Point group: D2
Amino acid sequence: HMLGKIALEEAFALPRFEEKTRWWASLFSTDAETHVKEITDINKIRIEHADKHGVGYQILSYTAPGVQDIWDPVEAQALAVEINDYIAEQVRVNPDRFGAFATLSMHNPKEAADELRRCVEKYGFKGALVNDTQRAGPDGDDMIFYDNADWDIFWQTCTELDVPFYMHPRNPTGTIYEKLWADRKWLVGPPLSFAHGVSLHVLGMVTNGVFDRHPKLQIIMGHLGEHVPFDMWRINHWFEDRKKLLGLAETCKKTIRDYFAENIWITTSGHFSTTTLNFCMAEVGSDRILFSIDYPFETFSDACEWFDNAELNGTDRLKIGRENAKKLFKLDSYKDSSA
Amino acid sequence: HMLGKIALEEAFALPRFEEKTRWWASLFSTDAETHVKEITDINKIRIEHADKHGVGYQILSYTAPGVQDIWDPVEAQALAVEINDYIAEQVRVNPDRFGAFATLSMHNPKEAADELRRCVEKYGFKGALVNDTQRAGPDGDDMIFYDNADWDIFWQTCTELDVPFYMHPRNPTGTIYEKLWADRKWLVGPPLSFAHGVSLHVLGMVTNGVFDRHPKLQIIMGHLGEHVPFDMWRINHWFEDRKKLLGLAETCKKTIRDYFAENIWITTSGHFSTTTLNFCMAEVGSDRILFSIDYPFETFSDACEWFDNAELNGTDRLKIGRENAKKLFKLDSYKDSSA
Amino acid sequence: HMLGKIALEEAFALPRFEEKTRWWASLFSTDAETHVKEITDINKIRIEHADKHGVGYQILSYTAPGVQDIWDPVEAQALAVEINDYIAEQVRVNPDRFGAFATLSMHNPKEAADELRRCVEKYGFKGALVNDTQRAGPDGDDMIFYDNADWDIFWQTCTELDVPFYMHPRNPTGTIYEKLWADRKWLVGPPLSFAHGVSLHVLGMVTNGVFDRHPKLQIIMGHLGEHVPFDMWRINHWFEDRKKLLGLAETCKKTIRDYFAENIWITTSGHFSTTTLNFCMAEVGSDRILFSIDYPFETFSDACEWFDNAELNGTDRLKIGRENAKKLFKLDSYKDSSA
Amino acid sequence: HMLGKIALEEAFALPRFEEKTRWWASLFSTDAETHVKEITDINKIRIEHADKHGVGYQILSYTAPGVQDIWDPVEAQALAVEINDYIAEQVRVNPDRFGAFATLSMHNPKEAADELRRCVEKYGFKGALVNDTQRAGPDGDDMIFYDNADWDIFWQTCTELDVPFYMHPRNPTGTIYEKLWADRKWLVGPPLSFAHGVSLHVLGMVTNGVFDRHPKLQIIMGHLGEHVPFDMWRINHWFEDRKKLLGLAETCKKTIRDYFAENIWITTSGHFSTTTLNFCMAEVGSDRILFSIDYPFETFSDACEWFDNAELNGTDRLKIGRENAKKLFKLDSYKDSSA
Ligand SMILES: [Mg+2]
Ligand SMILES: [Mg+2]
Ligand SMILES: [Mg+2]
Ligand SMILES: [Mg+2]
Ligand SMILES: [Mg+2]
Ligand SMILES: [Mg+2]
């Protein structure tokens, strides 16, 4: 029904990574051959789906774990550059249907900032999408988080370009995988592990002052906010009435509710629940919620049939379906953008 | 207003552990001296609070991390026995106001089963409360989870005695603490880390078949279910429409919704939110929700003023406030139990 | 999808009233020919629909306005008797799938009490369904309400037999129709007028003490309670904090919430909204909510595809879909009643 | 706690009408002496309350039933003019804290249009507030509704001036009162009758095409929309899937949801329920909801302690508390308007 929807947690993979794509599909797809075709296609199948389901514009991003899985920094950087150059060429075929987020190696703040800048200035990319922490160390068992002073140069590039950063999940790896997940491996990914990573990282940015140093910064979480809205009351209470009397206020100057009003966005990717959406409208506000699909891990049909037919007031259907994202991403037109 | 409420996430500590109690208070209390007094008191201050706030009956349990912090199995077992003997003596002073959960060393299934049995048969304890995984290994850096075949003898003791098991959180420790939490330490405890542990463990029990082998088993989570209700739609979708087509069905025979209807309970401890309660009533059902406080980490006043004054239908106020727990714990009377 | 559902706002009309059936259908059906066939059929089409949509048992009642439109008391009573004798014979064809509510002339309390008793004792009817006030007076411009002492003999018959009374709507007529509805006639029926009538009458029963004199009496409203749950807070406030200090307490001894917990039920007829259902769960409680369809004004498909696919915890899906009604109507087994 | 809130269902009475004030207070106040003082005071007590409770600006309007109770058109028009002249002088004492809605005789469209224009152009009033239908006829038993072509000249004046019209309730009178309310009189006012009147009139405006002929017109309902949001699903279904196929489309060209997105607003007057507010956020959207109090029928303390402490995201707290009304009424600065 609604046309001109915007989706922005929508993944692609390079054709040359077929073995890696099949491994990820073995965990998260029930049809590996269709998955390979869909995750690598840009301008045919994806357009056909979008045309059937009222999706005017998609901001595309690299599949997880993507560059965040690559612990050799030279290899990781070369891969990010390769991906960005590739997708820029592909989305030129349909500029009224596609934009792109930058894919980044996050081993080094300045390097990541320069590549984001190249993507925005040269190609008109819409922001960055990164799959949680950067794998690092000689065998990839370490993790680089971005919630510290090293990353100020990077966050300032985001605010200067005035583009958002999407904190996407990745799988647990190395010792964390072995200690917590291997004996309950069916919880890896959407059932639990993904949200544990993203919520940790974003709440780390909150409590380490990233949004105080960079109050213009916009961070996006998928999956209706990776559990955080469920605990908005509890986090707020344990911040304002507990931890902020014990030292948290030194590095965290606003409430969790303020950060969701001013800095944080959530999307509907992979979480096609009107009951949960309504609860998020209460705890986060419809102005801060964006439609998204999570293709090809989720189908256009599941996401769009859900959203198009959900019981919702017309004002919020318009905002969540497209108008919030239109404003955030400064889109002056695209296919069906005012339908 | 409502009298005869039951609370059952209510902690005590042994007087001899004053230094340890002060350390935990330094993280989670804004008034260490009052905290020490309240966590060690059983029969004076706690009764005064309950009398003011309409709490008829409290099931008491040992503070976290408690015995789960003790990696020497001989020491841990001796401590559990000591705690159970102690609290049995203390609650004899007010048997119409207090019951107790067993405190257990969870290093060994048979040992834990025998001590639970002793507590139930000798002292009339109401179940077990355990602070997530058992610390183990020479320096306590390993973790023992209970979602595997070793623990069948223990879960069968729970179902034979027909008493529930409360999966309470504990703090992250060792390598997990260093890798994930030390650089964002204000998230330790109620803001995030606690729920990550409990949800992992309980969803591990689900996906490893514990509730299929032990369909009578009742597991309780605090804090409105440690995020799980927020993702009921998403977990259910990623189980029934994804992982159960890839191998999960071999060890997981019912839906996540079935397990919440048949095996899992949530309490309101530390989560005094009518908006979130309403959402949990939708996703879990009021029949499966129990009032609780989380004293002395939370105050009676905060929990009871919230619940007593929350907008709620009378049927569910009665059930959540006491009648659900009255039935689950087979309470035929206690102070104000039918007021 | 759930089997063995119970629906109980399910209408029929006598074959000899085709003209009246067509007049009503001209207001409320988009396919009059199908409507005529469906509202008169009992044992064929209704079973075809119920078999496709998981409805095990239907409690049938007479179409609105039915006997309540008949202001001649002799004609009205004869019609009620005729209808009850008719439907008792029809349900005997397939008693495993159908029960019936009594149809009554409500001109005279004793007369209506005697006919309800005959229906329960002779035919095993499940209660009464009445279309709001009884038209009366020489030209049918008066209306008989049941919220006064003259009706005590009738309400005592309901409680003695221990069967519920379903307060169904009827159209506005006479002077009320001309003054309020004729100039906005598209609001007649489900859009507004029906709920105005039923809510007035039931809240009349509340404020005139019917449920105080007859505390066992069970009253059922369709359409998720005819707006009343929306104003549960506002009614409760304007009773307990206002009118109960000005004289209402003389004739109304409990709160509106008490009456919903003890006396009043709501059904899902004609209101296939999960968002509104959730809100009713909060304001009324799932123990007091019954599935129903409103056939043939609504389709089995709309009601059952909604309910069967609604996001809902399994506990409440079972209660609302059948278990609440199984208990309330003391039902023997019926098709799929324990599926 | 939020400062600079705007309230706009805030009543006053003329000092010379003490007897009428006391009669109304005998129905709707538990402290008549305080009520008399509060409803007549403008500039002292109202400011004391607003200063304590974070209310920066109050748009005042005339008490119900007000001019709508006056069936002599000459007396009614003279009274409306008197009231507007009176309140314009009162608000000039403290214009930073107060504005006013026009009080109108609604016997004649052109007359009411001319008086609304005088109030806006001469006094800077913010719109009109009218207590439902105008009593009329020789004995006041008739009622004038505004949902027809005779009122086009009036609705065009509202859109030309670009000011809203607040449809406030009044009591039932005359034949309607005797037939429906006299025997259940405790339902008169906030418990039920008020909402029945307003919802009828506004849904009359919908179904008679007022918002099609006047698409810019803004209509406001108090009391969270006078039940209408509860039936948003049911009305929409019975319009789009039923009545719109039977003739309603001839006079009603959009959906009920479209009219709530484009034309209709709701306020929180007298309905201090977060659960119901959340439901209205879903069904109507926070962009269309305005804080209000209903003083002096409700207290500042009840309304403001509720709203200031309600669990709500910060985006919507700001919009509902003041920013929606600041935009709708084109407000200059007032006390704490940007606090
Ligand atoms: Mg190949
Ligand atoms: Mg994704
Ligand atoms: Mg000491
Ligand atoms: Mg605790
Ligand atoms: Mg019906
Ligand atoms: Mg008012």
